[PDB]
Design a protein around this ligand. Structure first.
Ligand SMILES: N[C@@H](CCCC[NH3+])C(=O)O
Length: 238
């Protein structure tokens, strides 16, 4: 008994995973994976755009049936929702102006203004570790606002998923004068293990269908065909 239409929520400000083109159509690797899985599940799927911090509330309230939005699988989130198997890996990394001395450390960042997406694992990490100790951690409604304020000089640094910053900003016109500041921030407790489809705990039939379709499209080589459209390295990690 899967729904006739599966309603999938995503936050369309995280290119190359989820964004909108000039006509307002949904585009990106998350959209490609969701649509291929819906095709293999033989269900119809509707995409619903939402701010990132409204996604798990909307899911719990049944306004959407699944979340595909670079949603990291963490211990905290598993207390509330269920996840498909891993869609791809996601590490966190700081970005700042080229030549910046900034490092992901308290000593480097105390007194700096650091942007993080509201509702993200990065906001959790930065609030506990940095905001309490005097770093000015600023939470934003979406990631595009973070990049705009960084280039405006209102932020000194921003923490987000590494590949989103790389492909969605650093390799773009707008990020030419910016770079990663230090290596990926590893913290198992905060950042979890890769991203997955977020689902209500009791929708075990829907999880089984997403997991089976994901195995099948990885198996026959469709995942790698799709990933190569955006990435030249293995995004899945393994
Ligand atoms: N992967 C991070 C950021 C995803 C942001 C997507 N708009 C998290 O799960 O919180």
């Amino acid at each position: 008994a899967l729904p006739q239409t599966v309603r999938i929520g995503t936050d369309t400000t995280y290119a190359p995973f989820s964004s909108k083109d000039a006509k307002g159509e949904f585009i990106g690797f998350d959209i490609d994976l969701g649509n291929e899985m819906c095709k293999r599940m033989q269900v119809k799927c509707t995409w619903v755009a939402s701010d990132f911090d409204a996604l798990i509330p909307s899911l719990k309230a049944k306004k959407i049936d699944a979340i595909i939005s670079s949603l990291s699988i963490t211990d905290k989130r598993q207390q509330e929702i269920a996840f498909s198997d891993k869609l791809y890996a996601a590490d966190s990394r700081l970005i700042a102006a080229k030549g910046s001395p900034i490092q992901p450390t308290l000593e480097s960042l105390k007194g700096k203004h650091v942007g993080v997406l509201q509702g993200s694992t990065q906001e959790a990490y930065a609030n506990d570790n940095w905001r309490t100790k005097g770093v000015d951690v600023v939470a934003y409604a979406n990631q595009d606002l973070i990049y705009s304020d960084l280039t405006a000089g209102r932020l000194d640094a921003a923490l987000q998923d590494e590949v989103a910053a790389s492909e969605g900003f650093l390799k773009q016109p707008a990020g030419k004068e910016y770079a990663f500041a230090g290596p990926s921030v590893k913290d198992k407790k905060y950042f979890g293990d890769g991203t997955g489809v977020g689902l209500r705990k009791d929708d075990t039939e829907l999880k089984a269908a997403f997991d089976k379709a994901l195995t099948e499209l990885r198996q026959d080589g469709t995942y790698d065909k799709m990933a190569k459209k955006y990435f030249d390295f293995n995004v899945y990690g393994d």
